[PDB]
PDB file of all heavy atoms in Angstrom:
ATOM      1  N   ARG B  51      47.666 -14.260-128.695  1.00 37.07           N
ATOM      2  CA  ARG B  51      48.303 -13.639-127.540  1.00 37.07           C
ATOM      3  C   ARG B  51      47.329 -12.734-126.839  1.00 37.07           C
ATOM      4  O   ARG B  51      46.385 -12.253-127.306  1.00 37.07           O
ATOM      5  CB  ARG B  51      49.523 -12.869-127.955  1.00 37.07           C
ATOM      6  CG  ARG B  51      50.464 -13.698-128.792  1.00 37.07           C
ATOM      7  CD  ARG B  51      51.769 -12.903-129.047  1.00 37.07           C
ATOM      8  NE  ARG B  51      51.520 -11.641-129.756  1.00 37.07           N
ATOM      9  CZ  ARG B  51      52.418 -10.790-130.020  1.00 37.07           C
ATOM     10  NH1 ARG B  51      53.697 -10.928-129.734  1.00 37.07           N
ATOM     11  NH2 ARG B  51      52.103  -9.630-130.602  1.00 37.07           N
ATOM     12  N   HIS B  52      47.656 -12.500-125.490  1.00 34.53           N
ATOM     13  CA  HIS B  52      47.022 -11.462-124.641  1.00 34.53           C
ATOM     14  C   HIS B  52      45.633 -11.855-124.224  1.00 34.53           C
ATOM     15  O   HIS B  52      44.766 -10.964-124.076  1.00 34.53           O
ATOM     16  CB  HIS B  52      47.009 -10.096-125.345  1.00 34.53           C
ATOM     17  CG  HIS B  52      48.282  -9.742-126.057  1.00 34.53           C
ATOM     18  ND1 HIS B  52      48.289  -9.368-127.368  1.00 34.53           N
ATOM     19  CD2 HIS B  52      49.591  -9.845-125.678  1.00 34.53           C
ATOM     20  CE1 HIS B  52      49.536  -9.164-127.755  1.00 34.53           C
ATOM     21  NE2 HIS B  52      50.364  -9.449-126.787  1.00 34.53           N
ATOM     22  N   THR B 218      50.697  -6.457-123.250  1.00 40.83           N
ATOM     23  CA  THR B 218      51.231  -6.526-124.603  1.00 40.83           C
ATOM     24  C   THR B 218      52.657  -5.839-124.538  1.00 40.83           C
ATOM     25  O   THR B 218      52.827  -4.714-124.079  1.00 40.83           O
ATOM     26  CB  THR B 218      50.368  -5.863-125.673  1.00 40.83           C
ATOM     27  OG1 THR B 218      50.947  -6.080-126.952  1.00 40.83           O
ATOM     28  CG2 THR B 218      50.133  -4.417-125.435  1.00 40.83           C
TER      29      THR B 218
ATOM     30  P     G D 541      42.535  -9.473-130.298  1.00  2.00           P
ATOM     31  OP1   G D 541      43.098 -10.403-129.281  1.00  2.00           O
ATOM     32  OP2   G D 541      42.272  -8.075-129.931  1.00  2.00           O
ATOM     33  O5'   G D 541      43.457  -9.497-131.551  1.00  2.00           O
ATOM     34  C5'   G D 541      44.033 -10.651-132.034  1.00  2.00           C
ATOM     35  C4'   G D 541      44.862 -10.463-133.300  1.00  2.00           C
ATOM     36  O4'   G D 541      44.084  -9.711-134.326  1.00  2.00           O
ATOM     37  C3'   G D 541      46.076  -9.569-133.132  1.00  2.00           C
ATOM     38  O3'   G D 541      47.167 -10.243-132.517  1.00  2.00           O
ATOM     39  C2'   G D 541      46.355  -9.143-134.555  1.00  2.00           C
ATOM     40  O2'   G D 541      46.930 -10.223-135.305  1.00  2.00           O
ATOM     41  C1'   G D 541      44.935  -8.915-135.078  1.00  2.00           C
ATOM     42  N9    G D 541      44.537  -7.526-135.022  1.00  2.00           N
ATOM     43  C8    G D 541      43.667  -6.964-134.088  1.00  2.00           C
ATOM     44  N7    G D 541      43.560  -5.688-134.274  1.00  2.00           N
ATOM     45  C5    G D 541      44.420  -5.391-135.391  1.00  2.00           C
ATOM     46  C6    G D 541      44.710  -4.114-136.023  1.00  2.00           C
ATOM     47  O6    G D 541      44.221  -3.025-135.758  1.00  2.00           O
ATOM     48  N1    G D 541      45.598  -4.339-137.036  1.00  2.00           N
ATOM     49  C2    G D 541      46.122  -5.526-137.439  1.00  2.00           C
ATOM     50  N2    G D 541      46.993  -5.460-138.427  1.00  2.00           N
ATOM     51  N3    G D 541      45.899  -6.650-136.790  1.00  2.00           N
ATOM     52  C4    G D 541      45.015  -6.498-135.800  1.00  2.00           C
ATOM     53  P     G D 542      48.239  -9.415-131.678  1.00  2.00           P
ATOM     54  OP1   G D 542      49.192 -10.385-131.111  1.00  2.00           O
ATOM     55  OP2   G D 542      47.510  -8.509-130.753  1.00  2.00           O
ATOM     56  O5'   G D 542      49.013  -8.518-132.726  1.00  2.00           O
ATOM     57  C5'   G D 542      49.938  -9.072-133.638  1.00  2.00           C
ATOM     58  C4'   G D 542      50.441  -8.084-134.645  1.00  2.00           C
ATOM     59  O4'   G D 542      49.362  -7.520-135.383  1.00  2.00           O
ATOM     60  C3'   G D 542      51.233  -6.908-134.143  1.00  2.00           C
ATOM     61  O3'   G D 542      52.587  -7.211-133.822  1.00  2.00           O
ATOM     62  C2'   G D 542      51.130  -5.957-135.304  1.00  2.00           C
ATOM     63  O2'   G D 542      51.907  -6.338-136.376  1.00  2.00           O
ATOM     64  C1'   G D 542      49.679  -6.194-135.723  1.00  2.00           C
ATOM     65  N9    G D 542      48.761  -5.209-135.022  1.00  2.00           N
ATOM     66  C8    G D 542      47.997  -5.458-133.965  1.00  2.00           C
ATOM     67  N7    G D 542      47.306  -4.427-133.588  1.00  2.00           N
ATOM     68  C5    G D 542      47.649  -3.449-134.434  1.00  2.00           C
ATOM     69  C6    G D 542      47.308  -2.078-134.479  1.00  2.00           C
ATOM     70  O6    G D 542      46.566  -1.461-133.758  1.00  2.00           O
ATOM     71  N1    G D 542      47.965  -1.419-135.495  1.00  2.00           N
ATOM     72  C2    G D 542      48.885  -1.904-136.351  1.00  2.00           C
ATOM     73  N2    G D 542      49.383  -1.139-137.246  1.00  2.00           N
ATOM     74  N3    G D 542      49.244  -3.224-136.288  1.00  2.00           N
ATOM     75  C4    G D 542      48.596  -3.894-135.352  1.00  2.00           C
TER      76        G D 542
HETATM   77 MG1   MG E   6      46.442  -8.095-128.648  1.00  2.00          MG
END
Side-chain angles (χ1 to χ4, degrees):
Chain B
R51 309 187 299 176
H52 320 126
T218 187

